[PDB]
Design a protein around this ligand. Structure first.
Ligand SMILES: CC[C@@](C)(O)C(=O)CC(=O)c1c(C)cc2c(c1O)C(=O)c1c(O)cccc1C2=O
Length: 154
Protein backbone atom coordinates (compact mmCIF):
# COMPACT_ATOMS: atom_id res chain seq x y z
CA UNK A 1 0.00 0.00 0.00
CA UNK A 2 2.65 2.54 -1.12
CA UNK A 3 1.82 6.26 -1.13
CA UNK A 4 2.45 6.21 -4.90
CA UNK A 5 0.13 4.23 -7.22
CA UNK A 6 1.92 3.29 -10.49
CA UNK A 7 0.13 1.68 -13.46
CA UNK A 8 -0.61 -1.98 -12.63
CA UNK A 9 -2.83 -4.55 -14.42
CA UNK A 10 -4.34 -7.52 -12.55
CA UNK A 11 -7.12 -9.99 -13.45
CA UNK A 12 -8.93 -12.74 -11.50
CA UNK A 13 -11.93 -15.06 -11.92
CA UNK A 14 -14.80 -14.85 -9.40
CA UNK A 15 -18.17 -16.62 -9.06
CA UNK A 16 -20.59 -14.08 -10.58
CA UNK A 17 -22.11 -12.83 -13.84
CA UNK A 18 -21.04 -9.51 -15.40
CA UNK A 19 -24.60 -8.20 -15.00
CA UNK A 20 -24.37 -9.17 -11.32
CA UNK A 21 -21.10 -7.27 -10.92
CA UNK A 22 -22.87 -4.05 -11.86
CA UNK A 23 -26.21 -4.95 -10.31
CA UNK A 24 -24.44 -5.15 -6.95
CA UNK A 25 -22.38 -1.98 -7.62
CA UNK A 26 -25.49 0.19 -7.81
CA UNK A 27 -27.40 -1.88 -5.21
CA UNK A 28 -25.08 -2.06 -2.13
CA UNK A 29 -21.28 -2.34 -2.66
CA UNK A 30 -20.68 -0.98 0.88
CA UNK A 31 -23.04 -3.46 2.59
CA UNK A 32 -20.66 -6.30 1.58
CA UNK A 33 -19.06 -5.49 4.97
CA UNK A 34 -19.91 -8.44 7.31
CA UNK A 35 -21.52 -8.05 10.79
CA UNK A 36 -18.25 -9.16 12.44
CA UNK A 37 -14.74 -7.76 11.82
CA UNK A 38 -14.88 -4.50 9.83
CA UNK A 39 -12.70 -4.25 6.71
CA UNK A 40 -13.17 -0.46 6.65
CA UNK A 41 -12.02 1.59 9.66
CA UNK A 42 -14.86 4.03 8.96
CA UNK A 43 -18.44 2.73 9.09
CA UNK A 44 -20.03 3.06 5.64
CA UNK A 45 -23.52 4.60 5.94
CA UNK A 46 -25.00 5.03 2.46
CA UNK A 47 -24.07 5.38 -1.21
CA UNK A 48 -25.62 7.07 -4.25
CA UNK A 49 -25.34 5.19 -7.55
CA UNK A 50 -26.59 6.16 -11.02
CA UNK A 51 -26.05 4.24 -14.35
CA UNK A 52 -24.73 6.28 -17.32
CA UNK A 53 -21.59 7.43 -19.22
CA UNK A 54 -19.31 9.89 -17.38
CA UNK A 55 -21.26 8.45 -14.48
CA UNK A 56 -20.74 8.99 -10.74
CA UNK A 57 -20.91 6.90 -7.54
CA UNK A 58 -21.15 8.31 -3.99
CA UNK A 59 -20.45 7.06 -0.43
CA UNK A 60 -21.88 8.33 2.88
CA UNK A 61 -19.65 8.37 5.98
CA UNK A 62 -21.33 8.47 9.42
CA UNK A 63 -19.03 11.37 10.30
CA UNK A 64 -18.39 12.17 6.64
CA UNK A 65 -20.92 13.87 4.38
CA UNK A 66 -21.88 12.36 0.99
CA UNK A 67 -19.06 12.53 -1.58
CA UNK A 68 -18.23 11.25 -5.08
CA UNK A 69 -15.16 8.97 -5.10
CA UNK A 70 -15.16 7.90 -8.76
CA UNK A 71 -16.53 8.38 -12.29
CA UNK A 72 -17.34 6.28 -15.36
CA UNK A 73 -16.30 6.49 -19.05
CA UNK A 74 -18.90 4.49 -20.99
CA UNK A 75 -20.94 1.30 -20.50
CA UNK A 76 -20.41 -1.46 -23.10
CA UNK A 77 -23.09 -4.24 -23.18
CA UNK A 78 -22.42 -7.27 -20.91
CA UNK A 79 -18.80 -7.61 -22.04
CA UNK A 80 -16.73 -4.47 -21.31
CA UNK A 81 -16.93 -1.40 -19.06
CA UNK A 82 -14.43 1.49 -18.88
CA UNK A 83 -14.55 4.10 -16.09
CA UNK A 84 -12.88 7.37 -15.02
CA UNK A 85 -12.40 8.25 -11.32
CA UNK A 86 -13.65 11.62 -9.95
CA UNK A 87 -12.25 12.31 -6.46
CA UNK A 88 -10.10 15.00 -4.78
CA UNK A 89 -7.01 14.59 -2.59
CA UNK A 90 -9.12 14.90 0.60
CA UNK A 91 -12.27 13.08 -0.59
CA UNK A 92 -13.75 16.38 -1.84
CA UNK A 93 -15.70 17.13 -5.04
CA UNK A 94 -14.70 19.83 -7.55
CA UNK A 95 -16.04 21.25 -10.86
CA UNK A 96 -13.24 19.37 -12.64
CA UNK A 97 -10.32 17.11 -11.66
CA UNK A 98 -6.89 18.18 -12.94
CA UNK A 99 -5.42 14.95 -11.54
CA UNK A 100 -8.07 12.65 -13.05
CA UNK A 101 -6.94 9.40 -14.72
CA UNK A 102 -8.76 6.88 -16.96
CA UNK A 103 -9.17 3.18 -16.09
CA UNK A 104 -10.01 0.35 -18.51
CA UNK A 105 -11.97 -2.62 -17.13
CA UNK A 106 -13.35 -5.61 -19.08
CA UNK A 107 -16.24 -7.76 -17.80
CA UNK A 108 -17.09 -11.12 -19.43
CA UNK A 109 -19.76 -13.62 -18.17
CA UNK A 110 -18.40 -17.09 -17.38
CA UNK A 111 -20.77 -19.97 -16.61
CA UNK A 112 -24.12 -19.15 -14.98
CA UNK A 113 -22.11 -17.95 -11.96
CA UNK A 114 -18.57 -17.16 -13.21
CA UNK A 115 -17.06 -13.69 -13.81
CA UNK A 116 -13.69 -12.87 -15.39
CA UNK A 117 -12.60 -9.24 -14.89
CA UNK A 118 -9.51 -7.39 -16.10
CA UNK A 119 -9.01 -4.09 -14.25
CA UNK A 120 -6.07 -1.87 -15.25
CA UNK A 121 -5.52 1.59 -13.72
CA UNK A 122 -2.87 3.81 -15.36
CA UNK A 123 -1.15 7.14 -14.64
CA UNK A 124 -3.03 7.32 -11.34
CA UNK A 125 0.12 8.69 -9.67
CA UNK A 126 -1.04 11.87 -11.38
CA UNK A 127 -2.69 12.65 -8.03
CA UNK A 128 0.42 11.52 -6.09
CA UNK A 129 0.49 13.00 -2.56
CA UNK A 130 -2.06 11.12 -0.43
CA UNK A 131 -3.07 9.11 -3.50
CA UNK A 132 -3.22 5.76 -1.66
CA UNK A 133 -4.95 7.67 1.15
CA UNK A 134 -7.85 8.09 -1.26
CA UNK A 135 -7.63 4.35 -1.87
CA UNK A 136 -7.66 3.93 1.91
CA UNK A 137 -11.33 4.96 1.68
CA UNK A 138 -11.89 2.16 -0.83
CA UNK A 139 -9.65 0.07 1.46
CA UNK A 140 -7.62 -2.49 -0.52
CA UNK A 141 -5.47 -4.45 1.99
CA UNK A 142 -2.49 -6.32 0.48
CA UNK A 143 -3.73 -9.60 2.06
CA UNK A 144 -7.08 -9.20 0.26
CA UNK A 145 -7.99 -7.16 -2.83
CA UNK A 146 -11.38 -5.69 -3.78
CA UNK A 147 -11.90 -8.76 -5.96
CA UNK A 148 -11.46 -10.96 -2.85
CA UNK A 149 -13.73 -9.13 -0.39
CA UNK A 150 -16.56 -8.47 -2.89
CA UNK A 151 -16.26 -11.88 -4.62
CA UNK A 152 -16.39 -13.88 -1.37
CA UNK A 153 -19.52 -12.06 -0.17
CA UNK A 154 -21.22 -12.43 -3.56
C1 LIG B 1 -5.15 -4.50 -2.66
C2 LIG B 1 -6.23 -3.69 -3.38
C3 LIG B 1 -6.09 -3.87 -4.89
C4 LIG B 1 -4.90 -3.05 -5.40
O1 LIG B 1 -5.87 -5.25 -5.18
C5 LIG B 1 -7.36 -3.40 -5.58
O2 LIG B 1 -8.20 -2.70 -5.01
C6 LIG B 1 -7.54 -3.84 -7.04
C7 LIG B 1 -8.61 -3.11 -7.86
O3 LIG B 1 -8.25 -1.93 -8.43
C8 LIG B 1 -9.49 -3.90 -8.58
C9 LIG B 1 -9.02 -4.77 -9.56
C10 LIG B 1 -7.66 -4.81 -9.85
C11 LIG B 1 -9.90 -5.64 -10.20
C12 LIG B 1 -11.24 -5.66 -9.85
C13 LIG B 1 -11.72 -4.79 -8.88
C14 LIG B 1 -10.84 -3.92 -8.25
O4 LIG B 1 -11.37 -2.75 -7.79
C15 LIG B 1 -13.06 -4.83 -8.50
O5 LIG B 1 -13.50 -4.00 -7.70
C16 LIG B 1 -13.91 -5.76 -9.08
C17 LIG B 1 -15.24 -5.83 -8.70
O6 LIG B 1 -15.65 -4.96 -7.74
C18 LIG B 1 -16.11 -6.75 -9.27
C19 LIG B 1 -15.63 -7.62 -10.24
C20 LIG B 1 -14.29 -7.56 -10.63
C21 LIG B 1 -13.43 -6.64 -10.06
C22 LIG B 1 -12.10 -6.58 -10.45
O7 LIG B 1 -11.68 -7.34 -11.33
Amino acid sequence: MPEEIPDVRKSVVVAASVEHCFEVFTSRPADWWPPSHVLVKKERAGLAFEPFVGGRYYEWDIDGTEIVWGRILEWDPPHRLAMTWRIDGHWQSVPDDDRASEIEVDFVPNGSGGTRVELAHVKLHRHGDGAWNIHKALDGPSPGETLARFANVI
